[PDB]
Amino acid sequence: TAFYKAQPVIDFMCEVLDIRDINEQRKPLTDSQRVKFTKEIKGLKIEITHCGQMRRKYRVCNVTRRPAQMQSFPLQLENGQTVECTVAKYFLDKYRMKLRYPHLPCLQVGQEHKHTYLPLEVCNIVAGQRCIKKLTDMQTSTMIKATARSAPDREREINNLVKRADFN
């Protein structure tokens, strides 16, 4: 709902590794440089901004050494199955995004167990005056039993274990 910070990773890097122009780099980051930026992030809240239509928010987790041009990641398809695509190449086909920052490394972000590999842009930084909703409400009303029609659908057939009901 509220966010008072940003500083695109492009500026942060130029500020951490001292650079004249993020476009003049044209070189892969070395171990020293890579570890530098990685140490700064880690914990910071980064949001995705690249298509300029959906945008979202995620937390940082690590940095990939492979170049974006070859960043294979887990693309999940709502069709009913997960897929494995590559970053800095797929966007060029569907989003027509030429990246312009492949030679460099990539950013790693996952809420709890995700694997979203973003390039330089897209992964923006956030850690100023942010104020969102870290909770919600789950109360259903008019719960008058179920109607005498339709039927339950397939559910996650969890194996072993059996969940835990009640508290004590």
Side-chain angles (χ1 to χ4, degrees):
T1 304
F3 56 100
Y4 225 100
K5 209 61 241 163
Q7 245 109 133
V9 162
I10 297 294
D11 206 66
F12 205 49
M13 197 177 82
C14 177
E15 251 247 48
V16 177
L17 296 181
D18 223 339
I19 298 175
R20 207 246 163 76
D21 227 65
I22 182 57
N23 273 291
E24 282 262 56
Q25 232 298 327
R26 225 152 189 285
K27 291 287 245 266
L29 293 181
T30 37
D31 303 88
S32 261
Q33 301 254 113
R34 196 156 289 169
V35 184
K36 221 291 127 223
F37 189 98
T38 303
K39 278 299 118 120
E40 263 300 298
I41 60 161
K42 231 105 185 181
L44 270 69
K45 188 109 294 199
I46 61 114
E47 60 165 330
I48 67 182
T49 58
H50 65 266
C51 197
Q53 267 280 5
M54 278 276 102
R55 240 139 138 291
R56 219 102 99 75
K57 230 263 267 99
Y58 283 92
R59 175 154 53 77
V60 180
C61 257
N62 238 87
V63 175
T64 66
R65 301 219 276 285
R66 276 247 212 188
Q69 66 217 55
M70 290 233 275
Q71 263 287 273
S72 48
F73 67 108
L75 175 58
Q76 307 110 226
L77 275 295
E78 286 243 41
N79 284 289
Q81 56 139 128
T82 306
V83 168
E84 179 200 274
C85 213
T86 338
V87 175
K89 227 308 301 246
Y90 191 59
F91 291 95
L92 240 182
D93 231 66
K94 237 270 222 179
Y95 294 82
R96 270 206 204 286
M97 261 281 263
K98 229 299 168 118
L99 238 288
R100 231 146 145 292
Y101 292 108
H103 54 274
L104 240 82
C106 235
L107 236 297
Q108 177 100 253
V109 290
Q111 219 192 308
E112 216 264 274
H113 223 296
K114 269 177 197 283
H115 254 145
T116 315
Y117 291 84
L118 288 310
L120 280 304
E121 219 147 90
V122 201
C123 179
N124 252 86
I125 296 304
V126 201
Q129 234 193 324
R130 256 264 181 173
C131 228
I132 63 175
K133 257 191 264 209
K134 262 251 194 300
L135 255 129
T136 180
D137 223 298
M138 257 225 100
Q139 240 191 259
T140 301
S141 324
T142 17
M143 182 232 246
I144 177 161
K145 264 247 284 252
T147 33
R149 56 119 85 170
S150 242
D153 202 341
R154 248 253 158 291
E155 302 190 276
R156 238 122 156 197
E157 59 223 288
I158 296 156
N159 287 27
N160 213 255
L161 281 144
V162 61
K163 213 161 285 251
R164 204 189 280 284
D166 227 299
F167 276 74
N168 262 29

